[PDB]
Design a protein around this ligand. Sequence first.
Ligand code: A1CCU
Length: 255
Amino acid sequence: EFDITVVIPTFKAEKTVGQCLESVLSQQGVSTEIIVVDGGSPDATISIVQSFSSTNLTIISEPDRGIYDAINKGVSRAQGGMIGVLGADDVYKPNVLSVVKENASRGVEIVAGLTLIDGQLRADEQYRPAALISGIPFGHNAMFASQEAYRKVGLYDLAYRICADAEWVHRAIKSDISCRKVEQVFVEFNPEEIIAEACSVIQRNFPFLLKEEAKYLLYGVRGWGETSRIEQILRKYGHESVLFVTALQEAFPAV
Ligand SMILES: C[C@@H]1O[C@H](OP(=O)(O)OP(=O)(O)OC[C@H]2O[C@@H](n3cnc4c(=O)[nH]c(N)nc43)[C@H](O)[C@@H]2O)[C@@H](F)[C@H](O)[C@@H]1O
C-alpha cells in the first residue's frame, strides 16, 4: 500500500527522534509508512512520536531482546514495497526515498546508498562474494530491501548482537538477491567482541575456516592486515567451495 516502509527502533531516544521523524516525513514524491518499535522508553520518546501523529505511523511499545529483535518486529509488519531501517540519531537526506523508488522500479530487490559518518564517507565495499570474507559492504541504515528480499532471505539472527546486519547481507549475497548501489549519500549520523562476531559470521559462510583464519581474511580484505598467507589458505580449502575461491579471487586479485 506504500512505496516505502521506514522501521525506527528506539529506546530512550527523546533527544533526537524528532529530527529523525522530521527527516523521513519531509521526503517528497513517495507514500511512506513509519513503524516505530520502542523497547519501553521511560522518557518522552513516545510523547514526541505521538506529536507526529498520522495515519501512516505505527507505534509499538513493549520490551524486546535488543535492536535486531525490534527490527524484526517492524519488518514483519511492513506494508511498503521497499523497507529501510533508521536509528533515532540518523537522518535521511532529501529526495533519498524518491531515488530508492525509481531505482527499485526496475525490479532490483536492494537499493543501497552512501553513508556519511562524522563528515566522512563510509569505506564501502562491493556487494559480491568477496564481501563474505569481510563485513557488511555498505551502511545498513543506507540500505532498502524489498518485501521479496526479506521473504526469501528471512529475518535478523538474534544470536549476533552486533553484526546481525552483516550476516543478513551475506545471506542476501548468497541467495543471489539483486542489488543496485547508488553513489549518493542516503543517511548521515568491547571491540574484541565485534571481531569475534565478525569472524563467526565469516565462519557461517565458510564453516571449514578456523577463527584465526577468518580473522586473517577479514583483516586482509579490510586493509588492516597482511596478505602473504592468502595463497596458503586458498590451496588448503580451495577444494571445499567454489564460492570461497571466487571470494578470494575478487578480494585479492593478485592471487
Ligand atoms: C539502528 C541500528 O544501529 C546499529 O548500530 P548503532 O551504533 O547505531 O546503535 P545505537 O544504540 O546507537 O542505535 C540503535 C537504535 O535502536 C534503538 N535501540 C537501542 N537499544 C534498543 C533496544 O534494546 N530495543 C529497541 N526497541 N530499540 C533500541 C536506539 O535508540 C537507537 O534508535 C547498527 F549496527 C544497525 O545496523 C542499525 O542501523
